[PDB]
């Protein structure tokens, strides 16, 4: 009955247990979701554990290679990391045929350059999995092991298991939300905003952190407190997990770190210099993808914009500072003026109306579309602030930016539609840009 650690895991308290990848665990307390208490055969030490970070001894999730539930398009990004090398590989779930698994590999052709192959695995009604009916195996491990050893038609044989990253625990701590002011160590400037700063730092000595601080005056302690209730409950790949708060003012908001900052200035910098369109369209779908979540939970973001957007390895994009924008009780900015209002991101209806919904935030994600493929160009670049509202109320819309294919633009005029409910879905613009490049080449390789 034991469990056994996915990856490494450093103490950050007094009452948890670090823990090396491979470490046999036994969980001697189950009982919270989130953070069990377990005591390590090796080291005899107990303390609590994240328990994302462990899986049963025998079972498939503790194996290195399987990925579990992952997009094609997720598992894509990391087998194409230029670090790999070919036959890197994983396994996962198929999303198309329930119950069936996937086996993704990457490759080097001359005509494709660096590419992924996927084969389907399907189980037979006998018991046996298979790529090809030819050789079937009685457990995808030893599947896994045949094709290591031989390619067997696969494009590669299976060389390297698919690195990845450590998943964030659920919280910092367990039971750990409202923390004290006094363990977090503020130690380098990150920004500066209307409201207050973000600093990289550490909590209880330990782990790195990013601290957002509000100035005094900004939003009630108590509104602040329900709202990051809503905040805590929003989990999502593609939104930035908010770890925990000081509710008293100076109010603290405790949050990943992402080193590569925001998506506005990866956009302006050498960094951005030579991105091609079809990473600008993958940062787009990401985003839209981390808003399509906020659309199925309800909720609404309010401040979304290329500024707000934080990038990870891999390009990795993610949703931050959502649903914040509510509470500030500035009186020019509750009116959706003064020179804090991102007007140029705002909806007419939202602007005019405070009429702020998820179409809103398709509008703003319109204009989002605008800053990618300007390098974090300014949008309405010969206007300033106070006359934007009334131009789009006009009905003036930005043109085709240079460079961008009308196609997008088009999308982006999708989004600044007068009505609302004539805007598309972000479950429908996360769909359009993932699919944005069609591909002629087949789904899944041929069983043969
Ligand atoms: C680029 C910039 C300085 C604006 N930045 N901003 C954040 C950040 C954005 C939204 C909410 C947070 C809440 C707590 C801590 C940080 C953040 C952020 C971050 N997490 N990591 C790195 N840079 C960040």
């Given at each position: 009955?034991?469990?056994?650690?996915?990856?490494?895991?450093?103490?950050?308290?007094?009452?948890?247990?670090?823990?090396?990848?491979?470490?046999?665990?036994?969980?001697?307390?189950?009982?919270?979701?989130?953070?069990?208490?377990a005591h390590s055969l090796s080291t005899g030490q107990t303390g609590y554990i994240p328990s994302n970070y462990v899986a049963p001894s025998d079972s498939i999730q503790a194996e290195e290679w399987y990925f579990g539930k992952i997009t094609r398009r997720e598992s894509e990004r990391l087998l194409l990391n230029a670090e790999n090398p070919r036959g890197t590989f994983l396994v996962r779930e198929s999303e198309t045929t329930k119950g069936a698994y996937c086996l993704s590999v990457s490759d080097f052709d001359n005509a494709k350059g660096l590419n992924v192959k996927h084969y389907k695995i399907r189980k037979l009604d006998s018991g046996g999995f298979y790529i090809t009916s030819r050789t079937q195996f009685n457990s995808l491990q030893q599947l896994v092991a045949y094709y290591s050893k031989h390619a067997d038609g696969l494009c590669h044989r299976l060389t390297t298991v698919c690195p990845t990253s450590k998943p964030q625990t659920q919280g910092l701590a367990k039971d750990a939300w409202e923390i004290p002011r006094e363990s977090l160590?503020?130690?380098?400037?990150?920004?500066?905003?209307?409201?207050?700063?973000?600093?990289?730092?550490?909590?209880?000595?330990?782990?790195?952190?990013?601290?957002?601080?509000?100035?005094?005056?900004?939003?009630?302690?108590?509104?602040?407190?329900?709202?990051?209730?809503?905040?805590?409950?929003?989990?999502?790949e593609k939104l930035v997990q908010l770890y925990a708060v000081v509710s008293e003012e100076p109010i603290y908001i405790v949050g990943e770190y992402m080193s590569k900052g925001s998506l506005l200035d990866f956009l302006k910098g050498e960094t951005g210099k030579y991105l091609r369109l079809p990473q600008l369209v993958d940062m787009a779908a990401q985003i839209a993808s981390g808003m399509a979540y906020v659309e199925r939970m309800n909720y609404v973001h309010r401040d979304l914009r290329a500024a707000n957007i934080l990038v990870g390895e891999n390009l990795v994009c993610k949703v931050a500072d959502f649903g914040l924008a509510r509470l500030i009780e500035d009186n020019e900015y509750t009116a959706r003026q003064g020179a804090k209002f991102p007007i140029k991101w705002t909806a007419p209806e939202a602007a005019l109306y405070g009429r702020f919904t998820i179409k809103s935030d398709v509008w703003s994600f319109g204009i989002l579309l605008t800053e990618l493929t300007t390098k974090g160009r300014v949008p309405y670049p010969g206007m300033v602030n106070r006359e934007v509202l009334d131009q789009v109320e006009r009905g003036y819309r930005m043109?085709?930016?240079?460079?961008?294919?009308?196609?997008?633009?088009?999308?982006?005029?999708?989004?600044?539609?007068?009505?609302?409910?004539?805007?598309?879905?972000?479950?429908?613009?996360?769909?359009?840009?993932?699919?944005?490049?069609?591909?002629?080449?087949?789904?899944?390789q041929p069983g043969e």
């Open positions: 009955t034991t469990f056994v650690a996915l990856y490494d895991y450093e103490s950050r308290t007094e009452t948890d247990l670090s823990f090396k990848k491979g470490e046999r665990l036994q969980i001697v307390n189950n009982t919270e979701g989130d953070w069990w208490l160590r503020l130690e380098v400037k990150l920004g500066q905003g209307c409201f207050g700063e973000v600093w990289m730092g550490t909590w209880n000595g330990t782990t790195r952190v990013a601290i957002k601080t509000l100035k005094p005056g900004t939003m009630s302690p108590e509104a602040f407190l329900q709202e990051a209730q809503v905040m805590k409950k929003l989990r999502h043109p085709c930016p240079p460079e961008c294919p009308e196609s997008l633009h088009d999308l982006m005029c999708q989004c600044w539609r007068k009505e609302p409910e004539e805007r598309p879905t972000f479950e429908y613009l996360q769909a359009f840009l993932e699919d944005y490049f069609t591909s002629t080449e087949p789904q899944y």
